[PDB]
Amino acid sequence: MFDPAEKYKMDHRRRGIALIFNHERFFWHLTLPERRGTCADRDNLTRRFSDLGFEVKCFNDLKAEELLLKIHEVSTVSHTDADCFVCVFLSHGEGNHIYAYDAKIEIQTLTGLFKGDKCHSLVGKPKIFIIQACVYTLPAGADFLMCYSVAEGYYSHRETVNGSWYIQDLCEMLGKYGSSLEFTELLTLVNRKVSQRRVDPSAIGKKQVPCFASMLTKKLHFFPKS
Amino acid sequence: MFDPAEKYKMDHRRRGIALIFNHERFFWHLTLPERRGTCADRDNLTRRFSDLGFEVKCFNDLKAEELLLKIHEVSTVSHTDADCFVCVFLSHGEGNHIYAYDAKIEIQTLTGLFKGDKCHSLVGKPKIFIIQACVYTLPAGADFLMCYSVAEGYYSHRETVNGSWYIQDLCEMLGKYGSSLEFTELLTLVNRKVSQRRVDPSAIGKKQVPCFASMLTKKLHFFPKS
C-alpha cells in the first residue's frame, strides 16, 4: 500500500499564506543599492507567490510594537483551508554583529511558532521557510522545508539594484517552473543557477552555493489552483 | 540552453567507492542488541550499495593507528573514473559525552577531506554523506548531499537486533527503488517511512524525523550500470 509518488494534497480551498519578512531593524546605514535591492526582492517575491495562489503579507522589524501584533495574529490564524505555509526572511548583505544576531533570534522565533505542537492547523501540511542569510541558524521540524540563500562556510554576494542573486534566480525559476516541477526539483535548479552565476571586487573566484534542508515526507507540487 | 532535467552523468567506468565508517572507539560497554544491530546495518548497507555498483570499504575507529592509514589512502585515491562518492557514518544510540564529541570531530574531518578544494577528482561529482546521529554536526560543500538519521531537536530510537530504523528503512527503499527513483525522491520516502514508524519504554508518542540537506545541482539517478 506504500506509494512512492504520494504528494501533499493541494486540493484545499486556499493555497495558504506567503509571509515576506524584511529584516531592517538595526542596519545602521543603507546605500541606495541596498535600499533598492531589498525592494526588488519583496516585489519579485510577491509577484511569483501571488501567481501560484498565495496570500502575501509583508512585515518589517522597524515597527517594534506593530511587529509583536503582526507576528502573533498570523500564528493564531487557522490554516485548515490552506494547503501549505510559506515564510521568507530577507536580510541585507553586510551588516553589523547586532543586526546578524537579531536575525538568528527572529528566525528561531518564526520557525518555532509553526512547529507541529504549536500549529495544529498545519500538521501534515508543508511549512516552507526561505532564509536569506547574513547562536544557531539551523532549526528543524516535521514536514519542514528550510531553504537558505547560502550554505554554511560560503559567502553571499552583494545586493544590487536588480536584487539578490538567490531571490532573482528563485523567482525566475518559480515563474518558469512554479507549476511545472516539484519544489525540491525546482530548488535544485536554483542551486545550479546561483552556483554557476560565478562573478571587480576583492572577492574573485568565489561562488555562492545555496542549500535546502528537507524534512518533507510527500512530493510537493503547486499545480494551477482552481 | 538551460535544462531543468539535467542529471549528473553516471556514465563513467566506475560508479565510485562506498565508505562505511563505524564509530566504536569510546563506547564503554555494549549490550548484545547494540553489538548486533550495528552489524546488521553494515551488512544491509554493504548489500544495497554493492547492488547499485559501489566498491565497499568498512572501517572502525577501534584501530587508532590503522585509522589514519585507512582514511588517508581513500582520500588520496583519484575518482576520475568514478561517478560519485558515498560515505556512511554509523554510531550507537545512547553513548557518553566523549563518544558523541568524538563523533563530531570525525564527521567534520571526513566531510572536509572531500571538499572541492581538497579533492579535484570529485569536482562536479556528487558527494553523499549518510550520518547516523548520536561543536557542530552540520557542515557544507558544493555538490554535497548530507543525510541525517534524525533532525536537530529530535530523538533517535534504540538500536535492535534487526538494526536501526533509519538504516533498515533506507536499505529497503534502496533495494526497491535504488535504480527506479531519484535519490532525493528516494530519501523523501525514507523520511515518511521512519516518521510513520511511530513506536513499552518511557518514550511514548515520539517520532524520529530524518532530514537531508542538499547542495546538489543536477538530478541524481543510479540507473543500472553497464
Numbering used by the authors:
A (entry chain A), B (entry chain A): 30 to 163, 197 to 261, 266 to 292
The paper states:
Caspases belong to a highly conserved family of cysteine proteases that have essential roles in programmed cell death, inflammation, differentiation, neuronal development and axon pruning. In addition to being activated by initiator and effector caspases, Casp6 can be activated by a unique intramolecular self-cleavage mechanism due to its longer intersubunit linker. Excess neuronal active Casp6 is associated with Alzheimer disease (AD) neuropathology and age-dependent cognitive impairment.
Following our previous work, which described rare natural Casp6-R65W and Casp6-G66R variants with significantly impaired activity, we examined four additional missense rare variants with single amino acid substitutions located remotely from Casp6 active site: Casp6-A34E, Casp6-E35K, Casp6-A109T, and Casp6-T182S. A34, E35, A109, and T182 are not conserved in 12 human caspases and in Casp6 from different species. To assess the effect of mutations on Casp6 structure and function, we solved apo mature crystal structures of Casp6-E35K and Casp6-A109T but crystallisation attempts were not successful for the two other Casp6 variants. Casp6 variants were catalytically active against Ac-VEID-AFC but Casp6-A34E, Casp6-E35K, and Casp6-T182S, displayed lower activity than Casp6-WT in enzyme concentration-dependent manner whereas the activity of Casp6-A109T was comparable to Casp6-WT. Casp6-A34E, Casp6-A109T, and Casp6-T182S did not show significant changes in kinetic parameters, KM, and kcat, for Ac-VEID-AFC hydrolysis compared with Casp6-WT, whereas Casp6-E35K displayed slightly reduced kcat and consequently showed ~2-fold reduced catalytic efficiency kcat/KM. In addition, E35K substitution disrupts a salt bridge between E35 from the large subunit and K284 from the small subunit of the same Casp6-WT protomer, possibly further destabilising a functional oligomeric state of Casp6.
